[PDB]
Nucleic acid binder design. Sequence first.
RNA 1: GGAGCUUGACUGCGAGACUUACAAGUCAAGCAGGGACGAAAGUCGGGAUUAGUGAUCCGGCACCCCCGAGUGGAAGGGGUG
RNA 2: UCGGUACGGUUUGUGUAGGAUAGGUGGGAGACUGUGAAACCUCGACGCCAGUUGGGGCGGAGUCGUUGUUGAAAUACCAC
Lengths: 553, 48, 230
Amino acid sequence: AEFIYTMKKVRKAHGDKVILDDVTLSFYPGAKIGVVGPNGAGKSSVLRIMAGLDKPNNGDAFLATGATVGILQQEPPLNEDKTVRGNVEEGMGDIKIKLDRFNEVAELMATDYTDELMEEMGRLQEELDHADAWDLDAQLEQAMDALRCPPADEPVTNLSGGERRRVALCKLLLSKPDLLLLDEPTNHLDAESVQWLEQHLASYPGAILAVTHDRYFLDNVAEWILELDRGRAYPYEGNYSTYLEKKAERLAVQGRKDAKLQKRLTEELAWVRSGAKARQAKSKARLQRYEEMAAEAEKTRKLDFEEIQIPVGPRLGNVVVEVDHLDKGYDGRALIKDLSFSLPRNGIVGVIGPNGVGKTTLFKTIVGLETPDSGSVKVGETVKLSYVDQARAGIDPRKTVWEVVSDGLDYIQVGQTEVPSRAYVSAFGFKGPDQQKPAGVLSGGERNRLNLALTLKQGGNLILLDEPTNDLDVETLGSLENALLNFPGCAVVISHDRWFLDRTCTHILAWEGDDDNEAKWFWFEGNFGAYEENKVERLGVDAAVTHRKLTRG
Amino acid sequence: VRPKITLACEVCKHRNYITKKNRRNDPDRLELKKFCPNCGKHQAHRET
Amino acid sequence: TSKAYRAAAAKVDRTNLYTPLQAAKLAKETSSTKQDATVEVAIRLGVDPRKADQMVRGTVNLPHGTGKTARVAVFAVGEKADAAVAAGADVVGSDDLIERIQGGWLEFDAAIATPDQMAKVGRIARVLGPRGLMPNPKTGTVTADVAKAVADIKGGKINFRVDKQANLHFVIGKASFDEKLLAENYGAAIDEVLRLKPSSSKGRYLKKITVSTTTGPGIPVDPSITRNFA
RNA sequence: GGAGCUUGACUGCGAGACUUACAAGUCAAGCAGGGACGAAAGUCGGGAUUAGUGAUCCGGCACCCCCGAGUGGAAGGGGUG
RNA sequence: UCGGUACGGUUUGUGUAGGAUAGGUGGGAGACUGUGAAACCUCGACGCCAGUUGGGGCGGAGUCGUUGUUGAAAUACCAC
Ligand SMILES: Nc1ncnc2c1ncn2[C@@H]1O[C@H](COP(=O)(O)OP(=O)(O)O)[C@@H](O)[C@H]1O
Ligand SMILES: Nc1ncnc2c1ncn2[C@@H]1O[C@H](COP(=O)(O)OP(=O)(O)O)[C@@H](O)[C@H]1O
Ligand code: VO4
Ligand code: VO4
Ligand SMILES: [Mg+2]
Ligand SMILES: [Mg+2]
Ligand SMILES: [Mg+2]
Ligand SMILES: [Mg+2]
Ligand SMILES: [Mg+2]
Ligand SMILES: [Mg+2]
Ligand SMILES: [Mg+2]
Ligand SMILES: [Mg+2]
Ligand SMILES: [Mg+2]
Ligand SMILES: [Mg+2]
Ligand SMILES: [Mg+2]
Ligand SMILES: [Mg+2]
Ligand SMILES: [Mg+2]
Ligand SMILES: [Zn+2]
């Protein structure tokens, strides 16, 4: 019955937006809990209490004694040192300074007083046998071969979005905290780093929480679903096909219960406007029940959703983007080598490949922010280009969600038309006084919605989608992919979501590099389902591993 | 919309002052230099 | 099974807890049926070794010895090196021994060093890390006058140290001894473990104890009676 | 109306008044602490002024360590915000 | 009958050279009388990190230790 973490009557709320209210659940070790919910439900605000980063307003929430807590943030920060120095600040952070003193006491004690420093190295050399911390040179070299990290001698400022997330998982899987707190772990990770992390979290001592929107990762790392509706928490078991059943059932029995209440208001509002007859009295005990039914009928008024809407652009010519013998790299490592394709008119093109392989560099030669090595990029006279970005570089944190889209202006240009700016952002779900939240307090699911408001107001007929399916839930992932099928221009998508390129694609440009070339790509004419059948007929029939343990324990 | 925040000191953590801010214009915790009577001098004060 | 392990299993009852003398009585009637043996005692404590202040570590001197080789590697240079070989150290450490231990020759049993030449200890603990043959100040192996603990490690100062699963492991000598000689090492061990008992030990501190041979089964002993080991 | 630096939207007080059945309400020179701006003189105890609020009781939390039902503690009570 | 706790048997763990990688610790130079290369049995526990850890049929003819190294660490067997 020994526990890890307990909540007692926790109520955290950002005013009108409640996150918890009178909740109580207990977490026992060995539990594999996957937490779900819509965007903005409050999932990262729970984990910022469970990691001790925030405090609940009126409640009690405490970790048990021992068994410390390590959190993966939704946007994991790093330091300005190397990769091998990026994995020692946590996982080895409390224990490398006990080795930074032992190699100091080997020489500083030999010339000083050798009587009191005898125990000063005594209580530290006995801290190097219970943990076996002598192999700190070669424990890091095992934990980088597991995650397939970048080489550990170069800086970390110029890395991929999915290479920064690999070096941030190594900072937590070496600590081994007994309460993991993973906030959206499968962002930016390819189909290999997710399949690896499924096996590593399978045989793992301790409690695991993971707020994962995707349908297939939670069926492997979780067996006990936690849910966040508007305030409450609903623990049960199942494998995420039963979460969409129960949220559909909790709104069909709440929706028609709130319709019986509406008919009883019309039957009662007709009574309070009917006038008192001869010397009878209109009873005060029915006026005071009307004004309680009329108050409990306005508090249920939170039922709305906004669709993703892309503005249409001008007429697109016969030449969209032409690429003839492109070569691109940064060092002796070459990324793109001898690539020839041409983007079609009126289609959806998908770019497929593992992490750190050259997909964002392929867009940044097209948008004119890079320079090719050999070969040219050719656009054409008709194309207005629109470019969403993976890094979300356009949005700044200390400026509100309104006056990043606008600039203090009332009316904006969304391509040869003038819609009002607050009418434009309220078409992206940011409605009412949610338009004055800065970008530091917005959730990750609505910075993937704010970035679409900054860059789709260019109104171009060529949109470049650099991982749009990042932090979005199932309701607005389907609202995005229904806005690309009805788009008249050409859309290019980089994504790792296998069940998102299968649904909306017409053309595939996929990396197919092997050991002797390492830099070739492939243009395919067809959807994603026909590409995977051709991939297993050209190269490696039925061939297109064992889990690297990351540690010796 | 304008709750009552309280300003705790940064040295002694005494809760010397109480005032109001706007939650949506100022989502972060306010920092002011206020006089602390325990320390006898001006310290810094975040909220709680 | 081996059709001779069940011979000693037919002579020792499983459920009956025994005295500290009946364990040493059945130490002779189980081990000595086979060849020579060292008597093993495994103790499961009532601590949690995850915390820092419940790390039970200590040493004890045994009166009747333990009967082993005790290849003690005393590390000292100059005229201090001759004091070890006069005291009974077969191999005395120097600088030339460092270049052959790193070559792959680690045939020694302890490490009693001097505080002036501890610079070479951190370089020689490269391969002595997981072996656990570090010089320990708490066991007297790190001291100025190294002319005392040379015959003491020969005399039976076996180090006991709690593991990750809270299980002490300690030897009380060979199996060729007598009943009055084995049970006194058993009595001196537990009476010095209780001095190392931390003040934050929840529950019963000494939960279950056993005595075993090198081949035969284990003897369940009674943790309750600890006064009359003679 | 605009710009620079800032937190006095202070802690300990208050001679003397207004208004007033009472409960309340309101103004305040000046003295000390530790500060802001100013070259200084000086000004600053929120906002040009008058609305933006609720007596007592019972409780809650923070701190001060005043009482502690034989004694040492504690439970409870008390003060100050 | 379905569970809880206490007690005991059998069994489980395999990034990278390797005896598919004793899981940890401690003891240890022996342990059985040896063919998953066996006759009735013969992985139809798991079977995937595949072949060693069973269908315990029998045989005193027939495996394995320590050494070699090939490693953070080894090799049997055994209490823990
Ligand atoms: N510091 C804050 N101040 C005000 N509102 C916030 C703050 N943090 C979050 N919110 C609001 O509360 C919601 C909770 O965010 P949350 O759902 O925890 O993020 P995630 O979707 O990653 O779990 C957000 O939609 C945001 O609008
Ligand atoms: N400015 C730069 N200088 C050097 N190398 C870079 C730079 N930017 C990116 N790279 C390298 O290019 C490789 C491929 O990145 P890429 O795959 O384009 O990112 P993404 O995964 O976002 O598409 C990465 O491994 C990264 O190390
Ligand atoms: O590292 V990436 O998921 O942008 O290919
Ligand atoms: O945890 V999110 O709902 O911002 O993807
Ligand atoms: Mg999140
Ligand atoms: Mg990318
Ligand atoms: Mg402001
Ligand atoms: Mg005020
Ligand atoms: Mg007065
Ligand atoms: Mg002054
Ligand atoms: Mg000045
Ligand atoms: Mg004044
Ligand atoms: Mg006013
Ligand atoms: Mg009353
Ligand atoms: Mg009393
Ligand atoms: Mg009290
Ligand atoms: Mg006062
Ligand atoms: Zn203070």
